[PDB]
Tab-separated table of C-alpha atoms in Angstrom:
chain	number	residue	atom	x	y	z
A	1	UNK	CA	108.907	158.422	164.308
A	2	UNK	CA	109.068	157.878	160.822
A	3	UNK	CA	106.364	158.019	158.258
A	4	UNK	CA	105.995	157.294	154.177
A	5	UNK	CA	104.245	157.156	151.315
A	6	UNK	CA	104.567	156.514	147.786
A	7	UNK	CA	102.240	156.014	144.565
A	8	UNK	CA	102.654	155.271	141.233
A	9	UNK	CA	100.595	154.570	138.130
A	10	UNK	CA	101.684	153.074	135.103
A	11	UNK	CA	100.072	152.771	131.576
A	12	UNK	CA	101.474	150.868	128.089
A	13	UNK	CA	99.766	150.942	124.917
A	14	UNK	CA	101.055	148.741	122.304
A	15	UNK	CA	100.035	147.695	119.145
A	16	UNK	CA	101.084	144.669	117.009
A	17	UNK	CA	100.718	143.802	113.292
A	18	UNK	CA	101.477	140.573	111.281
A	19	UNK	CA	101.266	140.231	107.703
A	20	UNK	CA	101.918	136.246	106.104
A	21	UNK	CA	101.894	134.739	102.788
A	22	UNK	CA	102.580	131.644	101.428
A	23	UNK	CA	102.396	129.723	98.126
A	24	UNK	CA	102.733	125.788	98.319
A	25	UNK	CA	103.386	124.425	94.684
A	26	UNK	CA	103.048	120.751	94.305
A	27	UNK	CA	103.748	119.054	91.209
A	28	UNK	CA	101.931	115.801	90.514
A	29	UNK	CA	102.043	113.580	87.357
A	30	UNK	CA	98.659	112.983	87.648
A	31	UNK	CA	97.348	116.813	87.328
A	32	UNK	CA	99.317	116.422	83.664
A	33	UNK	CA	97.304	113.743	82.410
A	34	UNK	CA	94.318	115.450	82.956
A	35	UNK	CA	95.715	118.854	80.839
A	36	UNK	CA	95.121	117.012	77.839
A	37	UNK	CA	91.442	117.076	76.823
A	38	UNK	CA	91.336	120.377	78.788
A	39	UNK	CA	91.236	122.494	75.864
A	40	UNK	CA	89.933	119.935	73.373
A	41	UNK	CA	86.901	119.597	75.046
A	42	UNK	CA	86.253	122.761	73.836
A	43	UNK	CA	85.406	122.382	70.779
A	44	UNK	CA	83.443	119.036	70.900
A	45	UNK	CA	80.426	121.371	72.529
A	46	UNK	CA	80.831	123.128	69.344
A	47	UNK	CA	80.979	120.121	67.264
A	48	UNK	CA	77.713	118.812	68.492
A	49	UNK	CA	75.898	121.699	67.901
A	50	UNK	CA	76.756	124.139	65.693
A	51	UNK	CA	77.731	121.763	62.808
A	52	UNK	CA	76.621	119.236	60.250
A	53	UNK	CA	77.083	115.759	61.003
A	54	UNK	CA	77.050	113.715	57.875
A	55	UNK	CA	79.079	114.070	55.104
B	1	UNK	CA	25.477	92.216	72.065
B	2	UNK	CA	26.988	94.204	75.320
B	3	UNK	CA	29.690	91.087	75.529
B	4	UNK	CA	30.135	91.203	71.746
B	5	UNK	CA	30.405	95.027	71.534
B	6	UNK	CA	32.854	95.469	74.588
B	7	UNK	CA	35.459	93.218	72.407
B	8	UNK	CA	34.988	95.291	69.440
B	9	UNK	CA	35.332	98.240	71.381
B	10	UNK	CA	38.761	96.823	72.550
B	11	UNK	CA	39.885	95.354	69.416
B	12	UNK	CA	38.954	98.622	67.267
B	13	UNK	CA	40.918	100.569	69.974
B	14	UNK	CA	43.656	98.082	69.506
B	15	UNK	CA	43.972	99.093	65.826
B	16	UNK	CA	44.032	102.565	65.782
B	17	UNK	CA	46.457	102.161	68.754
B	18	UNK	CA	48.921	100.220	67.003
B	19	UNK	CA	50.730	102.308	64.842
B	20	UNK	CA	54.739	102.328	64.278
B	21	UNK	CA	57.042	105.073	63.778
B	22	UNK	CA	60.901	105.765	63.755
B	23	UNK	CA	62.184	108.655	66.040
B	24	UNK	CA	64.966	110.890	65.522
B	25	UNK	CA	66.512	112.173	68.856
B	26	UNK	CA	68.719	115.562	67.888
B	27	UNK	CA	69.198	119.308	68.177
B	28	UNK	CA	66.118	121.148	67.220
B	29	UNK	CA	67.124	122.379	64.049
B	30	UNK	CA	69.688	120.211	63.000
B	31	UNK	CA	70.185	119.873	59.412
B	32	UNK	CA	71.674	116.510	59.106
B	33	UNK	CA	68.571	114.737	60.374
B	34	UNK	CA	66.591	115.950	57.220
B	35	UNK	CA	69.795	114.698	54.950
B	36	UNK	CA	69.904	111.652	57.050
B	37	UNK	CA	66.487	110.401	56.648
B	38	UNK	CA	66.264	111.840	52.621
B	39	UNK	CA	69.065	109.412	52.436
B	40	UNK	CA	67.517	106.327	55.001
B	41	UNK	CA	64.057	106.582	53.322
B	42	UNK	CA	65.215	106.210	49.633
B	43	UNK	CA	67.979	103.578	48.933
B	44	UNK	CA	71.200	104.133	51.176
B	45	UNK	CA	72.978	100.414	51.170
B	46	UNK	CA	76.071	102.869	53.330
B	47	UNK	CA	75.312	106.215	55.035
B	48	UNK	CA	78.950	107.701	56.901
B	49	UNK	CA	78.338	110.586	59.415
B	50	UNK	CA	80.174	111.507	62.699
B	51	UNK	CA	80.136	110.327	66.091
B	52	UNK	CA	77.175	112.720	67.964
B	53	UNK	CA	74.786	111.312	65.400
B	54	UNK	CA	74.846	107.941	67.085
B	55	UNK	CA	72.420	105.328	65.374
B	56	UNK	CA	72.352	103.056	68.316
């Protein structure tokens, strides 16, 4: 006559980290066209109201 | 009478009313509308200024 017994007890800890970048660069022609009265602009605001209009 | 003084009443109203002026749409403090209308009023056959003025 043979008896058994048997236990067991089991425990995991884990832990996970992930870290991402990215930087997507597109280059269209139209995004230059649009540079040029980008700074311009500027100074028509100051044009129109900080100066004297006729000559 | 009261027919005769309702038209007057209308027609007096209509005078005083009609009265004409010319209005100059700018900045508050602008300087150039004082030059430009010194120059409009008295003879100006030619009067040059820049584009934010705009006569139209």
């Amino acid at each position: 006559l043979r008896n058994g017994e048997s236990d067991t007890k089991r425990n995991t800890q884990s832990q996970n980290e992930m870290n991402r970048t990215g930087l997507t660069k597109q280059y269209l022609i139209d995004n230059l066209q649009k540079l040029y009265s980008m700074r311009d602009t500027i100074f028509k605001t100051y044009d129109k109201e900080c100066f004297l209009h006729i000559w | 009478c009261d027919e005769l003084a309702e038209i007057i009443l209308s027609r007096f109203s209509l005078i005083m009313q009609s009265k004409f002026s010319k209005i100059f749409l700018s900045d508050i403090q602008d300087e150039t509308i004082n030059q430009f209308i010194n120059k409009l009023y008295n003879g100006a056959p030619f009067i040059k200024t820049d584009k934010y003025i705009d006569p139209e």
